[PDB]
């Protein structure tokens, strides 16, 4: 019964693809000791993930020039130490157009106009549209307060990150690896000043949505700025692309 889960412009949102997504995320959580969240809203989260995948796929797949595959074989061989191989290529082609389009929007001045440690931190996104259609910000603030409080109280992290986030890293708990104070968006200098490893960090106001940050751990300048820039402009671009779209639930 692989029916269509949603109507998304031209293509469709199917059931086998969400099945594959659930299988992959749950097996990875089993391997990586990440708590397996209850499939009450996990179904809808995976469905939303696939829907945004399809919309970002329609914007760009029809354009550009696909990608080669031998480099994919080499990369997966390195990462090792025909159903599976299909999803391996799609995440590269979807990121290729994503990596390209965000660069086109943002322009870069020479770094010398900007004059001149690594930390592990997680991120959670509350999807707020261009304007609160149902005044979501009103409830958004209440949910943000509740969830940051629960994070303080000592709840597990995979469940909270999975619960109702929106970004692509959210599946794996939303950890962004090691970052320094100057690869993070220009709104978290005060947040990193007023933070510590493992304590509470208040939610932050933003156009895209509030963000929950948990301190999980503790030539260059071009990438120093590029990381955080890329962050904010890619987030804004994906939000705007999602908003200007036609998606209908089917069930």
């Amino acid at each position: 019964v692989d029916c269509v889960a949603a109507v998304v412009n031209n293509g469709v949102v199917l059931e086998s693809d969400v099945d594959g997504l659930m299988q992959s995320v749950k097996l990875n959580a089993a391997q990586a000791r990440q708590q397996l969240p209850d499939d009450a809203t996990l179904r809808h989260q995976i469905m939303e993930r696939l829907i945004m995948d399809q919309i970002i796929l329609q914007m760009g797949q029809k354009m550009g020039v696909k990608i080669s595959d031998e480099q994919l074989d080499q990369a997966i061989a390195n990462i090792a130490k025909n159903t599976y191989r299909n999803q391996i290529r799609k995440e590269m082609i979807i990121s290729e157009v994503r990596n390209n389009e965000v660069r086109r929007r943002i322009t870069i001045l020479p770094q010398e106009v900007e004059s001149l440690t690594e930390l592990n931190l997680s991120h959670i996104l509350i999807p707020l549209p261009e304007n609160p259609t149902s005044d979501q910000v009103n409830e958004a603030e209440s949910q943000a307060r509740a969830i940051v409080d629960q994070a303080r109280n000592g709840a597990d992290f995979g469940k909270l990150a999975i619960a109702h986030s929106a970004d692509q890293q959210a599946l794996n708990g939303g950890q962004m690896g090691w970052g320094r104070i100057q690869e993070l968006p220009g709104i978290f200098a005060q947040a990193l000043s007023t933070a510590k490893k493992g304590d509470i960090v208040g939610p932050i106001r933003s156009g895209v949505g509030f963000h929950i940050l948990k301190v999980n751990d503790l030539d260059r300048a071009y990438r120093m700025l590029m990381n955080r820039k890329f962050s904010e402009e890619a987030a804004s671009w994906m939000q705007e692309q999602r908003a200007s779209a036609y998606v209908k639930i089917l069930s």
Binding site: V1, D2, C3, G11, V12, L14, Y246
Partner: protein, 232 residues
Amino acid sequence: VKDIHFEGLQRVAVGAALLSMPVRTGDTVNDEDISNTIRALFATGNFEDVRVLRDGDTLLVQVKERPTIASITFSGNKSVKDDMLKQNLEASGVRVGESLDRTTIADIEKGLEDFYYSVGKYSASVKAVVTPLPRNRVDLKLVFQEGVSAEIQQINIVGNHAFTTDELISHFQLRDEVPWWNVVGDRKYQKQKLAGDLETLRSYYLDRGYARFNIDSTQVSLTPDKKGIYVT
């Protein structure tokens, strides 16, 4: 493959339906192949809902047909004619007797907004209503809201030391103000009337031996209110 047949083919040619999808008969059937051919069903876009269902008996496919337009109506178009709107939708590939593209609805509305951009109704809103009909058809209600159109605030000729401004404005076609006791015209700016008015003004000066007189320029300005128009 033993048996293949499609539902809801009231107007659909079976030959096209079988030829579009890859598998026909006599090939292996598994989940990835059936999913791929389901994707290939929407390849033309001529469908709205096609799906595969789990059965131990042969094969069966559910299909829902795209509605085709039966008629179009334009209720709410006080100051314009229905037939021109019909021609406009004719040009935009929305000819009556075609599949109703629900995706394009916003573009259709916006195109009609640009159509009222010409007349002078700028704060207008058009809404679409979709009514299904038997035989799986569709009728369209086009609701038009022509709110308020542009109005000339004042005509301002500048630079003159022979004739007062009113003595000059009195002999144009477009008006900035009308007597309160009389109703014979409105301040409905038209792009064509500007050139005629400039010709009139040029004649008015030049007929009394102001030979060197010429226009420095003309200026039409819109207030960011879509109700006031200024002319200099």
